[PDB]
Amino acid sequence: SMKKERVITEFWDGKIIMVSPDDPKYALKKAEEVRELVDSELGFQQVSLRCPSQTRTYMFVSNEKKIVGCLIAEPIREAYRVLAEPPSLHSWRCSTEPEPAICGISRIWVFALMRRKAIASRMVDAVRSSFMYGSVLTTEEIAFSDPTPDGKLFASTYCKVPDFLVYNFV
Ligand SMILES: CC(C)(COP(=O)(O)OP(=O)(O)OC[C@H]1O[C@@H](n2cnc3c(N)ncnc32)[C@H](O)[C@@H]1OP(=O)(O)O)[C@@H](O)C(=O)NCCC(=O)NCCS
C-alpha cells in the first residue's frame, strides 16, 4: 500500500509533512493518534478547537519513519505580546492591546530525546512557508497558544525577541 503524503521540506535527518482536514482517512487516522500522543504529554483532555476545517497539523518524521515532532497550526486573526509576570513579594502576564496575527501555534512538541536539534524550529519554518499558499509568514505574524516555560524559552529565541505574540490566555 504505497500512498502519497504531503512533504513540505526534506532534511538530512527527516522530513516535515502536513495533514490538512480534507485529506485521505489514512492520513487523518495517523494525524489523530499523534495528536492524542501530544495532548496527553502536554496534559490536555478532549480539546475540541474552533474552525476545525482550517486546522493543519505538521509532523517531523525521522529517517527511521518515526513521528518525533508534531505541531498543530490553526487560523487566528489577532494576538498579544507576552509580558514577564511581576514577582510576588510574599511567596505569566500578557499585553491588553492586540496586534494582527495570521497563524496560531496551538500545540508544539518534540520527542524528548530529540530536542535541541532544531526540529521545533524547522516545523515552525514549515508553517511559515506552507500555512498560506504563496506567502511566507514572519516571526511576528505567528502566535503561540498558552506557551509552557519550555515553549517560552523556544519562542523567545525563534522569534528573536522576548515579547513574542501569544493567544488563548486566562
Ligand atoms: C523542549 C523543546 C525546546 C523541544 O523542541 P526543540 O526541538 O528543542 O526546539 P529548538 O531546538 O528548535 O530550539 C530553538 C532554540 O530556542 C532555545 N531553546 C529551545 N528550547 C530550549 C530549552 N528547553 N531550554 C533553553 N533554551 C531552549 C535554544 O536557543 C534553541 O536553540 P539552541 O539549542 O541552538 O540554543 C520544546 O519545543 C518542546 O517540544 N517541549 C515539550 C512540551 C512543550 O512543547 N511545551 C511548550 C509548548 S509551547
Which DSSP string do the residues of 73-139 spell out, in sequence order? EEE-S-BEEEEPPPP-S---EE-SS-B---EEEEEEEE-GGG-SSSHHHHHHHHHHHHSSTT----T
Q: How many CB atoms lie within 10 A of CB 57?
A: 25
Is the distance from CB of 89 to CB of 155 less than 8 angstroms? Answer: no
Burial class (CB in 10 A: 0-12, 13-18, 19+), 90: exposed
DSSP designation for 163:
S
Query: Letter for the amino acid at 71?
Result: L
Query: Letter for the amino acid at 5?
Result: E
CA-closest residue to ligand 1 atom 47: 151
The owner of cell 509533512 is 17
- What resolution does the deposited structure have, in angstroms? 3.0
Domains, the chain, with CATH or none? 7-167 (3.40.630.30)
CA-closest residue to ligand 1 atom 32: 116
The owner of cell 525577541 is 161
Alpha carbon of 25 to ligand 1 centroid (Å): 31
Reduce the DSSP state of residue 149 to 3 states and report it: helix
Is the distance from CB of 69 to CB of 36 less than 8 angstroms? Answer: no
Residue of 105, 154, 167 best suited for mutating to test ligand 1, as the one with most atoms within 8 Å of CB: 154
Alpha carbon of 5 to ligand 1 centroid (Å): 27
Q: Report the C-alpha gap between 82 and 99 in whole angstroms.
A: 12
Tell which residue, 88, 18, 27, 9, has the closest CA to residue 54.
18
DSSP designation for 55:
-
Alpha carbon of 117 to ligand 1 centroid (Å): 8
Q: In 3-state terms, the chain is what percent helix, strand and coil (to 5)?
A: 25, 30, 45
Q: Report the C-alpha gap between 157 and 147 in whole angstroms.
A: 14
Q: Report the C-alpha gap between 5 and 52 in whole angstroms.
A: 20
Number of alpha carbons in the 13 Å side-chain half-sphere of residue 142? 30
Reduce the DSSP state of residue 15 to 3 states and report it: strand
Residue of 11, 139, 150 best suited for mutating to test ligand 1, as the one with most atoms within 8 Å of CB: 150
Reduce the DSSP state of residue 41 to 3 states and report it: helix
Reduce the DSSP state of residue 49 to 3 states and report it: coil
**What kind and span of H or E run contains 142?**
strand 142-145
Number of alpha carbons in the 13 Å side-chain half-sphere of residue 94? 21
The annotation places the binding site at 110, 116, 118, 120-121, 148
Is the distance from CB of 44 to CB of 84 less than 8 angstroms? Answer: no
Convert 101-111 to b/e letters by CB count within 10 Å (16 or more is b).
Answer: bbbbbbbbbbb
Q: Which grid coordinates are listed for 42?
A: 502536554
Q: Report the C-alpha gap between 158 and 122 in whole angstroms.
A: 10
**Pocket around ligand 1 at a 6 A CB cut-off:** 42, 108-110, 115-121, 144, 147-148, 150-151, 153-154, 157-158
Q: Which grid coordinates are listed for 13?
A: 535527518
